[PDB]
Amino acid sequence: ALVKEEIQAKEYLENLNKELAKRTNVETEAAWAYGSNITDENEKKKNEISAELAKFMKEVASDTTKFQWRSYQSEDLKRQFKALTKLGYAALPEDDYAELLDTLSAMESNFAKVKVCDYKDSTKCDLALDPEIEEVISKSRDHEELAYYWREFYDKAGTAVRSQFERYVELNTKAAKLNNFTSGAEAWLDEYEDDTFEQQLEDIFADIRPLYQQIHGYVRFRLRKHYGDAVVSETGPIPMHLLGNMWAQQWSEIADIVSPFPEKPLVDVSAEMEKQGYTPLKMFQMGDDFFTSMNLTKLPQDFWDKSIIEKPTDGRDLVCHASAWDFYLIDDVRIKQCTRVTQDQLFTVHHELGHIQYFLQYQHQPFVYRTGANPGFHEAVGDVLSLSVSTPKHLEKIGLLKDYVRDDEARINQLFLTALDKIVFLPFAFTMDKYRWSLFRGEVDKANWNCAFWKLRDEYSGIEPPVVRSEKDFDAPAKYHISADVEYLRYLVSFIIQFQFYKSACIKAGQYDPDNVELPLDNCDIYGSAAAGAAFHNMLSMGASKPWPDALEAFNGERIMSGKAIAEYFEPLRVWLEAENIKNNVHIGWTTSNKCVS
Template structure:
């Protein structure tokens, strides 16, 4: 895939970079990086992101160390004790999510999982029932029931008439009255259930800002829409909520269950952060002309190793060109929106949980990860006030309405995962798992010439290294 969808596009990408620079200059920007960043209307955004990654880095290093040590028990010499993890062992083609290795690396494997899919099948769940449950969740927050147009326009199951149909879930705003819809091949599974909640977040955002002028009918910034979808899914995915709606029997929270659930979430959301950051940092560097054409591929893998501590399954060469094999690179879609969403959703979640009386930051026995804002009109009204603004005000104004803060911060994310971080630090000490990785990256030519990019370094927990430094 990398060879066919990436390397073959090298000439096209060079043309794209030239046109990107021309477009930026015509709009009075020095490069495409500044043009993309300008959409966030905050000159301090890059600094905010650097600060966020300095705060997250120690936690990510502990997660990486535990995963590498756990995988080594299975793969032996395939994984070194102090090097990057071969990305093909992380359960995802890009190593952007590690959730598919959860069963292989579970902290407490003897602790039964929630088994939601099995229970949904036993209770004869349908796609319609899943959507109705999601609607009821939003209505419980003092939001309106969905308009009839939603049910008439939506495809919530794959058509059976043989037509071509893209199954990736997508929420649509048709910008006419309350015409909104979702296209999704819903399956009866826990994953689909939470995807429904996420997509419904987009739908309610559309409906809440529908009275704004058309130019303002959008999220407060590119990351807001994704964050809104995810923040409601954070509540819906808790064992507490599953118990409330009858999908989980005899629920009694304990430390082992808490660690397992936080670990699963971290494999999906925390592992994603350095991937998303490095992907756009790489493109900013290309837009700014900081990377020579013969180093395009070398710089890509160097930045991925530095940020995430991963390496490609096989040696990649200067002549390869792997970044465009990722859809968003070839399609000119900035990835920062997903990074911003992963930070903002925890800020939203914390503030909503405090409003709902579901979380007390001063109580050591109160866990942000166990908060469910279901049926809290106070939290719902705060969301409605923020979301109804759409793009009519700068995004810090929208953020301030719900959170009282005007900048992004990783502090809520760190509070959410604090029990897991404490457990990982203790576990890694017990097992002797090394924290950090030494660089193994070398830029090689297929002709055999070797050109090292940067000196090998060992990243340790007590040394703060900016993820973007190359």
């Protein structure tokens, strides 16, 4: 019975893979329509399609129980069946499932329709996060203006959806239990296929905390000289609204005021991008070039015909948060980005294009294997290229960085600017899932949900709100991914493993030798390296066909997620920075925040 049944099973899967691909295509199309044009109508359609696919997924789960799949010889077949048993939200009773979609939709659409009044003109009330409020948080050095925009934004994107958030936690939890995980924490963590994963990340975070604390301390020092001691204390958490970003996840936008050597060059090519007439189209074409230059795959025509790479001008509602989309056919991949001509946006274009490349690289695989080896792998791909693009080396080659001397002081400036984006983010990213895990697991009482957020943010990042908050506010959904039910640990894993890929890609490209001051890891450009491209191909082409350790091994021979590489990259900075903090008697650490009242 069992040798025969295994042969039938292979044909069952082959055939079922194709059907899921096609049914997902339709669901994706409806999601796309909504996300690119928010209306009551498109909401209904997206939600009804999803409901129907959920119903089919349930029959598929049920059909898995008819096959003796755990007894089969083929690891590969067992892997595909295992994946089909994991329903996620689709396990919910029909009505509960529809209620959950309506709750998610309410939250995501609240986020995307937020608008605030101009600080200087309360008649003018149509400022959106993207682009208006983002530009003020990133450019203004008026602490009171900054604080105003912070409060207006968090009040509308966060507090306004407490009731919905709460319902979502209930449903998320119910759904996980139906799949027999303890909570949604364990449902998310199952993607990493490793029991010790949480512990591994705590270990890695603990090894990098000291460097993070040195950075924190230095930035605080510099902010005090800018804003004065009335605005920033020596010993407390940094007021977050001064850190150049609405969530303080990255601080690179205040590099003008905290850079180690302000006499020396600090790389910001936005102004040159605008002077040379760059458009979004050019930016995407440069990204394409980067990948084709490494002998990877060209964007297909469908990409250019159907992508949305600039913010519509018909004043409609849409989700402007940048995203990459697989449509599960052949060569139908798309990006929706409300692209602006800046350095940071050029990196985002590479980031998103990294997802697109992953899609194209694994599109021959069976449907259940057409995703990342783990979610962090997907988010890392494009960032490995962004690491290169951001190098002075690369930016001189493309004519965006003019008259740059690469002295020791400019290296330090560049290193620190990178650290503001890459080290700073790690605690931030860890907290976004720690908060949510703690609610999913039932560890925090509803009475304390807002202060448990800011508590994590204090303990891990050493920041706090500009104003006093309380349990009358609900601040966590003011972050896109929280409002939209996007797991965030992927981004923590990405910011660690991308240094492992980059370092390895740099070695393959000839651009990095430890024992050679002409090839330092932080000036490595892998543009043009078919040797780097080959490693990418070997790993990305695998999809989720094997456990992620085997995908990493395809790239570089390793099997372990490790913080060695990111430390190696920042080692030069750490040595200078420790010494500079001691030279200036810089206070390190912070007192417990007093900005969330229970």
